[PDB]
Amino acid sequence: MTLNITSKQMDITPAIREHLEERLAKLGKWQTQLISPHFVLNKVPNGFSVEASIGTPLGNLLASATSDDMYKAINEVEEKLERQLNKLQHKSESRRADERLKDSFEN
């Protein structure tokens, strides 16, 4: 799984690329398997607007932030993505009748 980029304007470079990639590799340790990962990176006069979009067997990941701090914006996105990630693994703790932690045959 490789974190792909789109970047409507500012092209991708070692920094971003390595950053996003590093972030993905960092999110790899997380209870998830990035089902085709992307990163919609963007900039603007008032700062930098970033938006991430990854996939997970538990739920597609998405995020977006705007700030005058590139890596901080990314810093934020990763926070969202992570937050959602934790949300995925978290989810409802009472799905009607719960799922229980039993497994062996189911029959």
Side-chain angles (χ1 to χ4, degrees):
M1 287 73 241
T2 71
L3 176 155
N4 311 115
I5 14 292
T6 313
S7 323
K8 79 206 268 218
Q9 32 164 115
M10 50 152 154
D11 310 73
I12 3 296
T13 21
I16 275 88
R17 195 184 234 200
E18 179 131 36
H19 200 34
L20 324 178
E21 286 193 311
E22 280 237 55
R23 282 311 209 178
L24 177 93
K26 192 129 134 142
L27 265 186
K29 167 212 108 132
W30 278 81
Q31 285 48 266
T32 287
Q33 34 272 33
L34 311 337
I35 294 194
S36 170
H38 248 123
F39 251 80
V40 177
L41 191 88
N42 307 301
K43 142 181 222 218
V44 282
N46 295 120
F48 283 88
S49 5
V50 209
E51 175 206 61
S53 315
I54 322 184
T56 101
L58 336 179
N60 312 359
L61 294 135
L62 314 166
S64 22
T66 302
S67 244
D68 219 332
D69 277 31
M70 251 236 82
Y71 269 22
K72 190 97 224 282
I74 275 119
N75 214 284
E76 240 115 326
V77 189
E78 220 266 338
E79 237 261 80
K80 288 259 141 163
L81 251 268
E82 203 245 63
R83 188 264 182 79
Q84 335 219 338
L85 264 130
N86 203 38
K87 229 260 253 181
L88 315 190
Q89 304 117 5
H90 275 23
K91 67 170 255 291
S92 74
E93 303 217 83
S94 267
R95 206 143 184 161
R96 250 263 218 161
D98 217 296
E99 200 119 273
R100 217 112 95 181
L101 220 143
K102 58 142 127 104
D103 49 273
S104 46
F105 269 130
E106 266 174 62
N107 48 19

